[PDB]
DNA sequence: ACACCCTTTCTGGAGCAA
DNA sequence: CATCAAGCCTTCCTTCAGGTGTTGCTCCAGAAAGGGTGT
């Protein structure tokens, strides 16, 4: 089953790339040493072979959300919105290992090297949730394959293929957003501002005195840590139309129905990260099932046999498969 | 819960963008070198994708207030207007670290590399203020999600939803506003204007000769600079979002929104730059704002009323307590 | 606390907008080159989002005086006849750096990066003058928030918040006023007017020869220029906001507003521009202004009368003192 | 009864570059 | 209805933040002996 979810982020996208990146105040990424630089936390970037100029494929940077992040977003969406309410409305409860296996593929960091029986493998791949995300102590193949969230851009034209010339994007799609943390105690202004503080003016003056001592120590170092922190993070600019490729090799109809229910409940979900700055908010503007567009304003339109299958399976959903899926053979 | 606080700024909005940007005496932003240049401190602006050629969408600038700035504004009006009167009214006094953890995210720049217990996580995410704003030494996630203040503009037409198209403004929304600082010794002009000056005439003469020696070869008070601002009267929008909130947390947000009328947005405090009025507040798509404040949402106001009653310092203390 | 000072300019207003703008003899601001352009210093203009037609908001020009000019003007009137008399009737001697920091917010152009102690911050924000205007070497935040002087105009309709539905000026509020400088000795006539010039006719004839050599090909004299001014007789609006003031500070601002009529708003000093009367002062919405100054707000006046007594130089000295 | 299936059971070393 | 005026100076940024914690892999890559039991 081929599912293609074209979304539109209405907030910036921030999937933080690991690394030690810096930036000048003017906006130059990774400056040579000597000039003053601030920590930059770049967004996640996929190198893509693309056609720059004419017939000259080259590796260009295109900033994305990883398929692991979107796979866990899909997993936690169908978990918080479908699977957990189905378990709550009945008497079924999960162990902490079963909850850990359902949310992160495993209960412990150490798997057991023995694989499970063919009957249990077949029944877990027939399961609506466990078939999508087959983890556990004995590693199963989950039939859900989740691609990265690619922005519909020229740099991904060898990724996107034909049919994506509408709402086209060129050029840079990222922006460095600067964030500052000020010291609260420097923003104290009067005795009315300080009355909620134990000690008041004495404690405030002690905070200024420790900041002056630490500043003198840092000046002796240059020529603990305070609360001033001016820094930067690169985000992907809002308003982009993104492609999200979801694949299912011979799924049970309830499993693709569960993916459809999760895509229905992607409303009020954040894609990558930067929670407190409301980053990752998005609007789905299209879902195509095997190339057939099945999205409307009121969620998924059509595809009814998937929804009846997943409703019947959620009615038949229990905690027994989750418990014996997470049960280690070595334990 | 999805709140849309659509506001209109009375005065020019100035959130100072980082960078050594420059301006000529005309309206040329960042000129080529070899011409007379002045330091320009531009407004904070966000690139947004917008339909510019009626088929082609492109990354265009749009001057905003950052969601960090508006989040700290909401946090500070909650603290100085709701939380601190409830704390000093009941006699509760936070520690200096607890005050720093209330106004910033924590008290120290080094967070603890341990996770807190689930009982603690549940108590603070059920707490109104600490549930809205996480952080601390052990990296709590708040339930509040604060977007940038976006102007209702055709550059943001892919950013806003529906119903804003009749209000959507086109064209440039900024101004290079010029400021200057005199050396006020040059403005003295009289021998009875130096009787307040110690030394008097000889002191004013020494300041003049020091300025002349500095100009012949420390920085004086003569400054001429510029800052780009968003134009006043612009209609904005502010997307506050709530990840599974308690009704007390929503009531704390609405209590903050009721008394942001005397609060300033971003920078320009001496120029009264941050002044604004709230045109509307949509509470999950339903309008709850009027002239007197937020009407309706009564369960949220009652929940934050019973939550502000019994608000103790010890929750902030063991939120700020390191490990 | 919100103060709304509604003034009406008696003479034209000229706050010169920076920029080499040009004018033709029949109007046509900033023409294409070759139509004999004349130098034009336009008055200060703020772009304001405004209703241009039914359902369309555009960034229109609106001629204002910037809030920095108003902030320094308020600082200067309190310094000129409330603060300096309080220092020299008591014999207090401000330093020259203290005078610089009082009249301009700083003594030098290099603020200290170190923060001041909280007791110092509390004393200066509780100070009547230093609380209004902060700054200094360690960058104090003042309690005063001075808006720019908008006119009562329909272009400012989104600025005023529909407080005044009458007296709304619709058309343009500006005139290009032309000023020319005559060469003095081009109008002598007789040799009795040149007998005071040393040498007599020979020095004026040498100056005429130098002017001729300049005209065939060093700057001359008798230039022709234009300056856009706001037309007189219209009604303005001023907003002076306060960040939790002591009543001595409110009394200081009202004492500035009482004898505000002696000073000028920006202007050309020679042309007597910037003259104005105050038609009203709104203290948080209630009118406290009459023909005989300010009537009402008595506790602010008693507080500022208490604070002017005992106002020593010592606070100014350790406000301007740089670490 | 002879075929596949499901379990145990069992002996030794140990350093490591790109 | 024609020119003559058809700017001049000077400002032309200041300090500071200029990251913190964690993560820092897991497992298995055998074949026979000795029991069952299912066709």
């Amino acid at each position: 089953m081929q599912i293609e979810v074209t979304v539109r982020n209405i907030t910036p996208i921030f999937s933080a790339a690991p690394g030690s990146n810096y930036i000048t105040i003017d906006g130059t990424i990774n400056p040579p040493p000597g000039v003053s630089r601030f920590p930059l936390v770049r967004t996640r970037m996929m190198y893509v072979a693309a056609d720059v100029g004419d017939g000259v494929i080259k590796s260009v940077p295109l900033q994305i959300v990883p398929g692991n992040t979107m796979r866990s977003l899909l997993r936690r969406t169908m978990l918080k919105h479908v699977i957990e309410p189905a378990l709550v409305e009945k008497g079924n409860k999960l162990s902490i290992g079963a909850y850990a296996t359902a949310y992160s593929g495993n209960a412990t960091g150490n798997p057991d090297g023995v694989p499970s029986s063919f009957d249990e493998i077949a029944t877990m791949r027939a399961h609506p949730f466990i078939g999508l995300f087959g983890g556990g102590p004995r590693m199963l193949e989950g039939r859900l394959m989740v691609d990265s969230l690619y922005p519909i851009h020229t740099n991904a034209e060898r990724i996107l293929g034909a049919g994506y010339e509408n709402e086209m994007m060129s050029g840079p799609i990222t922006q460095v957003v600067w964030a500052r943390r000020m010291d609260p105690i420097l923003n104290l202004g009067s005795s009315e501002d300080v009355e909620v503080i134990n000690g008041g003016a004495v404690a405030a003056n002690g905070w200024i005195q420790d900041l002056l001592a630490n500043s003198k120590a840092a000046a002796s170092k240059k020529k603990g840590r305070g609360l001033k922190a001016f820094n930067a993070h690169e985000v992907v600019i809002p308003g982009l139309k993104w492609v999200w490729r979801i694949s299912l090799d011979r799924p049970t109809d309830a499993q693709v129905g569960l993916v459809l229910l999760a895509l229905n409940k992607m409303t009020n979900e954040r894609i990558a990260g930067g929670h407190s700055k409301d980053y990752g908010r998005f609007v789905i503007d299209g879902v195509s099932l095997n190339g057939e567009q099945v999205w409307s304003q009121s969620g998924i339109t059509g595809g009814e046999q998937y929804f009846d299958a997943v409703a019947e399976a959620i009615d038949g959903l229990s905690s027994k498969e989750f418990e014996q899926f997470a049960q280690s053979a070595k334990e």
Side-chain angles (χ1 to χ4, degrees), chain A:
Chain A
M1 161 72 54
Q2 279 341 305
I3 301 176
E4 202 131 338
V5 196
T6 53
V7 308
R8 207 233 317 271
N9 62 317
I10 55 176
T11 61
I13 287 295
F14 182 52
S15 172
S20 150
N21 293 288
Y22 296 91
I23 187 172
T24 44
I25 198 72
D26 295 331
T28 73
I29 275 44
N30 299 321
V35 62
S36 96
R37 50 193 209 151
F38 304 98
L40 174 76
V41 193
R42 319 206 49 183
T43 173
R44 188 65 87 90
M45 155 275 258
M46 183 40 93
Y47 264 109
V48 186
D51 203 324
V52 297
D54 56 347
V56 169
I57 306 311
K58 266 173 33 53
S59 188
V60 303
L62 177 83
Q63 285 87 15
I64 63 146
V65 191
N68 208 16
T69 298
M70 314 276 330
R71 184 173 172 94
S72 171
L73 174 63
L74 193 57
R75 176 202 297 259
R76 293 180 280 102
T77 304
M78 59 181 72
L79 263 189
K80 296 270 174 203
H81 295 269
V82 191
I83 303 305
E84 262 174 80
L87 259 43
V88 152
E89 290 163 85
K90 289 155 172 233
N92 302 282
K93 293 217 187 202
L94 310 176
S95 62
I96 200 96
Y99 186 89
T101 295
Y103 265 89
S104 58
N106 268 95
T108 71
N110 326 73
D112 35 41
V114 60
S116 77
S117 70
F118 291 116
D119 276 276
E120 169 189 9
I121 287 159
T123 51
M124 293 313 173
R125 298 198 100 234
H127 200 251
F129 180 77
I130 294 173
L132 295 181
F133 313 93
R138 308 155 303 274
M139 255 158 264
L140 171 77
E141 176 165 306
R143 33 191 60 173
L144 188 61
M145 307 142 293
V146 174
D147 204 10
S148 298
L149 191 78
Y150 297 104
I152 298 184
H153 198 255
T154 62
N155 287 4
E157 282 304 307
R158 291 163 69 85
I159 285 198
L160 289 152
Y164 279 117
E165 282 75 23
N166 46 299
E167 292 199 347
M168 207 30 191
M169 190 99 216
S170 285
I173 47 144
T174 40
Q175 191 183 210
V176 167
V177 172
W178 296 81
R180 187 180 52 165
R181 200 177 46 181
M182 341 182 66
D183 193 34
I185 313 306
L186 273 36
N187 284 313
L188 283 171
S190 64
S191 290
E192 259 205 55
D193 269 28
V194 88
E195 197 191 275
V196 83
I197 299 172
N198 227 292
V202 180
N205 284 340
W207 189 284
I208 319 296
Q209 185 186 9
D210 312 341
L211 272 171
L212 270 38
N214 281 46
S215 86
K216 185 65 178 177
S220 165
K221 179 85 171 189
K222 292 291 181 69
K223 202 56 183 300
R225 178 172 160 84
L227 280 172
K228 295 231 152 273
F230 190 52
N231 37 57
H233 56 281
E234 179 192 38
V235 302
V236 188
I237 67 148
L240 300 203
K241 180 143 156 279
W242 307 69
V243 64
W244 190 23
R245 282 181 307 236
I246 299 296
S247 300
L248 299 89
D249 45 332
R250 316 145 292 190
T252 278
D253 260 352
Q255 291 165 328
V256 38
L258 188 49
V259 176
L260 282 191
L261 276 193
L263 289 176
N264 254 17
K265 308 272 181 13
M266 292 276 180
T267 321
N268 325 287
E269 295 286 315
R270 295 313 167 258
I271 273 175
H275 193 249
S276 52
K277 328 187 178 237
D278 215 343
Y279 290 164
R281 192 201 181 131
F282 71 108
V283 168
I284 302 183
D285 45 67
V287 173
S288 71
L289 252 58
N290 285 326
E292 186 243 328
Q293 183 61 227
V294 291
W295 181 261
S296 56
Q297 218 47 254
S298 61
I300 299 279
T301 182
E304 311 103 302
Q305 92 259 30
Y306 311 124
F307 286 123
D308 296 48
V310 72
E312 181 200 341
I314 262 64
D315 250 1
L317 189 58
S318 100
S319 72
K320 152 188 50 66
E321 301 95 1
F322 287 96
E323 286 289 333
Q324 66 132 339
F325 184 60
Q327 205 31 260
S328 167
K330 98 167 91 83
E331 305 177 68

